[PDB]
């Protein structure tokens, strides 16, 4: 009942990203394969969206293009370590209804103090590498 795909996105020179609270770093579009008609992007708020989330990095999956009115999808995000291995993930508890231009994600994906702590190895060589797995419900 689902078609599963994944995507990685490396944000080089992460410490040079000057985005403040409410601002966004956006990935290029991606899809499940060359024949896929859907287009998706990731959007990261490195200092959250508002005062109550400013201590988190927020991460969203955005449906950029789809042929019909809606797409239902489950999704999971993780950060890759220096070996390109998944660390902790955060995964949606169900499929969510996307329409063109709609996002779903986690406002509190990771605490900034955890992300920035050298002990955790999440910014190797000043790169933030995000990994997204999506399970698209087939219509």
């Amino acid at each position: 009942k689902v078609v599963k795909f994944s995507y990685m996105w490396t944000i080089n020179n992460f410490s040079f990203c000057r985005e403040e609270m409410g601002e966004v770093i956006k990935s290029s579009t991606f899809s499940s394969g060359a024949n896929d008609k859907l287009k998706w992007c990731l959007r990261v708020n490195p200092k959250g969206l508002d005062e109550e989330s400013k201590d988190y990095l927020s991460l969203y999956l955005l449906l950029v293009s789809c042929p019909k009115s809606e797409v239902r999808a489950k999704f999971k995000f993780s950060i890759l370590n220096a070996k390109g291995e998944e660390t902790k993930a955060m995964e949606s508890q169900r499929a969510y209804r996307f329409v063109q231009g709609k996002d779903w994600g986690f406002k509190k994906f990771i605490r900034r103090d955890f992300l920035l702590d050298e002990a955790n190895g999440l910014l190797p060589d000043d790169k933030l590498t995000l990994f997204c797995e999506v399970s698209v419900v087939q219509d």
């Binding site: 993930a89 949606s92 508890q93 779903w104 994600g105 986690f106």
Partner: peptide, 12 residues
């Protein structure tokens, strides 16, 4: 790895 299963939110 560990996966924390959570409700999603939207910015709209």
């Amino acid at each position: 790895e560990v996966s924390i299963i959570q409700g999603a939110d939207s910015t709209t």
